[PDB]
Amino acid sequence: DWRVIVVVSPLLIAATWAAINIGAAAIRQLQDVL
Amino acid sequence: VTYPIFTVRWLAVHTLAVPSVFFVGAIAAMQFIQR
Amino acid sequence: RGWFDVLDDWLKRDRFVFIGWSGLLLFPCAFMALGGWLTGTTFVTSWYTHGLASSYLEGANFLTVAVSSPADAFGHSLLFLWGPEAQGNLTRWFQIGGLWPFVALHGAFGLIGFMLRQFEISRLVGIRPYNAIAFSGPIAVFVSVFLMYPLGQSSWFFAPSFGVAGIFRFILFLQGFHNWTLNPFHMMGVAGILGGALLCAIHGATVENTLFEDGEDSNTFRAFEPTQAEETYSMVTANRFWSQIFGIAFSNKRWLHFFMLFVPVTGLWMSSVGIVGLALNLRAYDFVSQELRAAEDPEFETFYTKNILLNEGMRAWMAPQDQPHENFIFPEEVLPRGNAL
Amino acid sequence: GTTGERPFSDIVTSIRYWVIHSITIPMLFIAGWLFVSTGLAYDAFGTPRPDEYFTQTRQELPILQERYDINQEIQEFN
Amino acid sequence: VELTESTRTIPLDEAGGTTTLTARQFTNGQKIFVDTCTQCHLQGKTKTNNNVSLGLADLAGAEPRRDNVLALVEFLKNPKSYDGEDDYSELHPNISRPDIYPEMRNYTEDDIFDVAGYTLIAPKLDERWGGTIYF
Amino acid sequence: GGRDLPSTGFAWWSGNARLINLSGKLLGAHVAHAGLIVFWAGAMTLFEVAHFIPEKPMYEQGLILLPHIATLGWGVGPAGEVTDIFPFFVVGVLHLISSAVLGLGGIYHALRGPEVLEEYSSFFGYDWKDKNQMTNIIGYHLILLGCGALLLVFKAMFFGGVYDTWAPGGGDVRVITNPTLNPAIIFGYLLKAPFGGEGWIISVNNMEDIIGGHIWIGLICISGGIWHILTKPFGWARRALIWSGEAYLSYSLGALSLMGFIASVFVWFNNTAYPSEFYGPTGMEASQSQAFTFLVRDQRLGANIASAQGPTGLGKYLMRSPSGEIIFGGETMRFWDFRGPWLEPLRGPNGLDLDKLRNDIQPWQVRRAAEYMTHAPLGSLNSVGGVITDVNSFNYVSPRAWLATSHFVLGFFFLVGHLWHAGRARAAAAGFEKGIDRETEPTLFMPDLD
Amino acid sequence: ASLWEQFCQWVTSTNNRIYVGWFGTLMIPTLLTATTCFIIAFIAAPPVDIDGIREPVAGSLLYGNNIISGAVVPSSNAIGLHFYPIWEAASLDEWLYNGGPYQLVVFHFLIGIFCYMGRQWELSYRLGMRPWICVAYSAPVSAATAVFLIYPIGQGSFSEGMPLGISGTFNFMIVFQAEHNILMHPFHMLGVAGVFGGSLFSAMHGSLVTSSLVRETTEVESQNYGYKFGQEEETYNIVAAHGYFGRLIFQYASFNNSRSLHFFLGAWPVIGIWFTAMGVSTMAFNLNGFNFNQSILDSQGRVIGTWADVLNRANIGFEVMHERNAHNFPLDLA
Ligand code: CLA
Ligand code: CLA
Ligand code: CLA
Ligand code: CLA
Ligand SMILES: CCCCCCCCCCCCCCCC(=O)OC[C@H](COP(=O)(O)OC[C@@H](O)CO)OC(=O)CCCCCCCCCCCCCCC
Ligand SMILES: CC1=C(/C=C/C(C)=C/C=C/C(C)=C/C=C/C=C(C)/C=C/C=C(C)/C=C/C2=C(C)CCCC2(C)C)C(C)(C)CCC1
Ligand SMILES: CC1=C(/C=C/C(C)=C/C=C/C(C)=C/C=C/C=C(C)/C=C/C=C(C)/C=C/C2=C(C)CCCC2(C)C)C(C)(C)CCC1
């Protein structure tokens, strides 16, 4: 269903933008807690 | 100085606020549904 | 370090949102209940259970939306998503009103988790658990109204719907069908709630108007620090004022605050006992002496008999729409009505 | 006073926070918008669109009366 | 269902003629009904005289019958009594007397056609159309 | 000039209390707020004109300012028909431009003028304790208020007149040539009971009475203005009153509360200064109209409306008031004191006359009664007309309902303001507005009550 | 020295067991008059023709009522807003028939409670208090004035004022809903927020103070004996209560300043009751609650019901049966 694609895809864009703007500090916080 | 970013407080905020903004956008689109 | 004690350490950290052992019951259940209510009032109809529109998707507003009660045909079926009605179909589950037992059950277990949270944090901080004892009132209300009232009735249909106008419907329904204003248990509830509101207002006004001059600013709020030892307001002046104004006054701070606890909690418990009675249609509907007299004497009218007539009119004009599963066909000539209206 | 977490007034007054949210919050808004405007919410929840409250063969209220076979009941109700 | 053509198909005259309104014509007739008619004809009743309501049986029982478009248009030009005997031009709102009814002096003939079409379609959308004041 | 709470002792939510002893900034706040009032008047009038269908009744369109302009006799003719759109637009434009001027002046005094006016001039410099200067300002404002009352009188007498709803031939803009200068009538309006059938000053029923009262009000206000400018407060006034800025504010709040209550009752009951052609019928007018409408309809059906008894034994259409006047029956028996220009033609010396009801009812009275009955001041908050059990198809709430409700709410909250400021003024002049001194707590030196 | 000054000193005395004051010199006669007439009318008044249609309603205990059904019945609809004292009646029996006791009780009671509010200010001034307890009392006063005075004025008859009885109050409320849809009025909703929240916050405040009491008694005696009247020190640990409540919700949702907490405790139910008093006072002028009846239509135009439509069915059933014999015309204009 194209409806499912065009509904999920905005969430995917939001998640990937948050990931590529927070991922360095996210991996650092994951490392510091082992 | 050098606070954590991802906490229980972070998840507590998003669990509520991410579907809140999703639902608000839904109801905003509902405002333009014709009979 | 045992794994239980390590988990106990993690659950009871001093963070922004306290979790605790009670949080494992509270947070998923409260989230499920709140998300179910918001989901139902945003997207889910009551068209097949009630013949009504009750979501924002259908054009209802914040007053007119509800997670409405399920269809009367299901009885007191718990209406699980995997249950024999819905049979795993989420869409069918939404349409048959399964969001109502979803919200009501998760809400009830979340209320349990919240009073457990009150107990847990009271134990950790080191205070007495009177906040949980006070919260017993709201849980008594929720259990009697949303659970034992429909259980005593024919189905979950006659439970209150989780909505503003749906609750107003439940309220008017209980007036017209049960004469719930006439019930003394509700009168004690009303007395408790209005007394709690009175005590709140009077206690706040008395403290704010018997404050000690403990600062140089006209803004009196900065004349307090939490770690101070002495009282921020004059109990002696407050006592003298209310003794000369009202006749009596509080002379004990601890008794004052226990009474502020006691009045609305007792009101809630009393109204809950009345709702338990109403679950079995054990109403204070009538004063039989006045009906026997009114049936014998057509000159006898009180405000009670007028209220009885109001209830009959409401029942006859509301029941075909309020109970569409019954297929109540009331032709216009049988509807009770006064002259010219 | 501070339990350990970053204070909210520090967080929401940052460039990086608003760089992430200038994107996340409006695009969640448009996700809800496309949930409603593509009509997927009607199919997901079983809510009637404004022309399926009544069909050409049913003009009364489709009050469920079945206790177990409600799927076929909703189907013949349409 | 939709606002179908069968919902908008209404009798045009006494001789079996029918006209089908448009969606725009129905919307305009509804808007005119909200603006000028509903103050006395809310939900098809008549608050001033509910013996003569806007119900379809009421419209059919008039002399001549007012269940068609041209009859309602004629009543909105020259209103009469229910039996057609008396003159209601000074008592019912109309388009032939702009001196005493200025709220309808800016209505064209097509506007009267639209409001008559709405007056014939609205009874089959509401079952309480033309009932008792409190119904 | 302290603009923070350490420099003033007032928090931001009480921050205009920092202006109490800063006269020039206080003058700026006032002028700026005055500009707000004139701005709303102008912009709301422009909105009402832009949302005006002039062939439609004003009460049907949610207008409250155009009825006020039309009552003064601007742009209207017989029975309130709008002849000219332009005077309403002129009144709007004038207020909007004067508001721009007033806002510039208020912002100047509030942000660049002398913060205190007592170091610049002894005329505008005021100390709150200075009883003579405050009475001078009372006197100035009194002189200008009397001039405004005389300006209304000049409009009604020499500038085209005002709308008289009671005028022969129907209501019209007529010139008041004989205002009642009789002090008996004018001041016995003040002694009439504020109850049913008397109505205090709400029952003022003719434009001559209103205009004569405004001549008296203008004379009284100009005389009192010259009084407060020429005299100092006497010893009884100085010994009874609190003399401080918060005290004078609270006195004015009590007066404003009184005036808001009176205005709500005035727009609800009076149809002379609030004509029903512009403000719609009153509740009493609509109920009497319903009774009259169904009297006319059933009389046309051949019913004997005099001898028709209702289900209760009272007359269905006609009955007696408790003093014996022939009045309409039904629940409207309670509205039997209603007087209106459509109904006074059918009233004899004993009440509603049977001969006039039998053979003197005109079609315009029938039309007016049907319109007023169907425009009763009953409506939902969302503007759905009729009784609240009606469905959603009639977009109407009466301007009388809006005005009465608003001004009753404002009058109540201004009574609350009077109580808050009268009490705080007394507490502050007495010295215990900040709380009880611990060393000299007054109750600690009193005997026990028992 | 003077007799008048001696009387003024007695009137304004803080050593009176019950404070009189100048507001009390009006309060005490009006309240005693209203109390005496209310008690006599509640026990033994004859039936009252409230609707003005010669259908007298038995209100008193001696005429077949109980405590729940008993009321001082409002004055006649034939009177309307007319001033009806005893001396305007031809006899006392006529005065009783037309509901004169209700007018007497209500007018003296309203003067008395306004003077109670003035007296509360007066005693706060004589005791060196801050003066705003009377502002908090102005919310029940406004509600009482709304149901006994303002609603009769707007409706045009003192027969529309709330009856002075329990079942009479229920009758007032039900007719109010059928006519004004008060449940849909947001001012009543704010009132329900006020009373529910006031009771909530009363329970919260009381439960937190009782929870954080300082140990000053044994486990045998009542804990209230841990407080001595006029003690300087605090009887409970506010910091402990704040730690509990800022862990129960989160830290910044809890008051730590007791003065802000008590101002909130005063302000919430007072503002709620102010709003509901104004709601009843504005439905006096028929500005009613929201009308959402037939607000949702399908694409054909058929009405889809909501819960407001079921509420309207209940309102219609209440309306068509109310004052069953008083209406002669199709619309209940007031
Ligand atoms: C009618 C409303 C009104 C008016 C006229 C005023 C007026 C005033 N307030 Mg104030 N206030 C108000 C409402 C109002 N207030 C409300 C609702 C609050 C609660 C939030 C406050 C809380 C408050 C505090 C805490 C203080 C004041 C103070 C002041 C005074 C000086 C302000 C200043 O110096 O800083 C200047 C502010 C600015 C320069 C910001 C720009 C705002 C401008 C003026 C906007 C208006 C311009 C307009 C768009 C242009 C139109 C002009 C023309 C071209 C058409 C001033 C006389 C101060 C005081 O007491 O003086 C010693 C002060 O401490 N007020
Ligand atoms: C209630 C309103 C009010 C009051 C009491 C004041 C008072 C004052 N102003 Mg201010 N002002 C106001 C409003 C007000 N103003 C408005 C609306 C504006 C915008 C135009 C100004 C702009 C303003 C400026 C730019 C200045 C003042 C100044 C002054 C001070 C000296 C003025 C003086 O005596 O010279 C003599 C007085 C006269 C020559 C009287 C002339 C008559 C007036 C101006 C015209 C008549 C008004 C109107 C047409 C009549 C009816 C009003 C209408 C709205 C109904 C004085 C304390 C001066 C100052 O700051 O002090 C150092 C200064 O320079 N004002
Ligand atoms: C709004 C304009 C205004 C203002 C602010 C003032 C203000 C003042 N005047 Mg003034 N006055 C005015 C207009 C005004 N007056 C006018 C227009 C006139 C011409 C008639 C007068 C003639 C006048 C005189 C002769 C005196 C004052 C005095 C005073 C001072 C004290 C009055 C007092 O204590 O009140 C309270 C009044 C009393 C306690 C007396 C009892 C009055 C009863 C309670 C009134 C009953 C009203 C009733 C409740 C409402 C029903 C309405 C109706 C039936 C009356 C005060 C500063 C006195 C003064 O100090 O001289 C300089 C003084 O002797 N004035
Ligand atoms: C013209 C009349 C008037 C004047 C000049 C004053 C002046 C003053 N008052 Mg007072 N008061 C009044 C009427 C008046 N009041 C009324 C009618 C009431 C009853 C409600 C009060 C109750 C009151 C209280 C409780 C207090 C004051 C206080 C004050 C002082 C500072 C207040 C401030 O900074 O504003 C600040 C403004 C705000 C913080 C914003 C207020 C906005 C309100 C809450 C809602 C607005 C509603 C409005 C209708 C718009 C609706 C918006 C909606 C659509 C969202 C100041 C000298 C304070 C004091 O005693 O100091 C000496 C104070 O504590 N007043
Ligand atoms: C500016 C707002 C004023 C509106 C009046 C409402 C506030 C007062 C109500 C209290 C009644 C109880 C009286 C005894 C209680 C009592 O004695 O209070 C005492 C308390 C202590 O004040 P202080 O003496 O320190 O300062 C007040 C003055 O003396 C000088 O600032 O007074 C206040 O806090 C006033 C603050 C109000 C300003 C902000 C309040 C805004 C609330 C309303 C907002 C809208 C609500 C509806 C929205 C849906
Ligand atoms: C059902 C269900 C479920 C669940 C879900 C969930 C859990 C979810 C959710 C959800 C959510 C959680 C949602 C949300 C939301 C929201 C909203 C819709 C909001 C809102 C709002 C508003 C509108 C507000 C406004 C305002 C106000 C009024 C106040 C202040 C200001 C403001 C503006 C802010 C699942 C899947 C498991 C399964 C199936 C069943
Ligand atoms: C002090 C202060 C304040 C206040 C302020 C104010 C209060 C103000 C004002 C002001 C004002 C009071 C203003 C105004 C204005 C006006 C204007 C600016 C106008 C105009 C004009 C025009 C331009 C017009 C035009 C037109 C015409 C001609 C007609 C037609 C239409 C039109 C519209 C186009 C505040 C609070 C903020 C705070 C801070 C401080």
Ligand SMILES: CC1=C(/C=C/C(C)=C/C=C/C(C)=C/C=C/C=C(C)/C=C/C=C(C)/C=C/C2=C(C)CCCC2(C)C)C(C)(C)CCC1
């Ligand atoms: C225009 C008009 C008119 C006229 C009117 C007039 C001529 C008037 C007036 C009036 C007046 C001439 C008034 C008044 C007033 C007064 C008041 C409102 C008062 C008061 C009071 C007070 C405020 C006091 C207080 C106190 C006391 C109680 C004792 C101790 C001291 C003190 C101060 C605390 C008329 C209707 C004919 C017609 C229509 C229009």
Ligand SMILES: CCCCCCCCCCCCO[C@@H]1O[C@H](CO)[C@@H](O[C@H]2O[C@H](CO)[C@@H](O)[C@H](O)[C@H]2O)[C@H](O)[C@H]1O
């Ligand atoms: C805000 C929360 C969002 C709500 C969730 C959105 C999705 C809602 C459901 C729509 C998805 C498909 O909708 C419906 O899903 C159900 C599962 O429940 C499918 O149901 C299928 O699997 C279930 C589970 O075994 C069984 O009933 C059966 O095998 C079959 O019917 C239906 O064939 C489909 O019609």
Ligand SMILES: [Ca+2]
């Ligand atoms: Ca019209």
Ligand SMILES: [Cl-]
């Ligand atoms: Cl009637």
Ligand SMILES: [Cl-]
């Ligand atoms: Cl009744």
Ligand SMILES: [Fe+2]
């Ligand atoms: Fe306390």
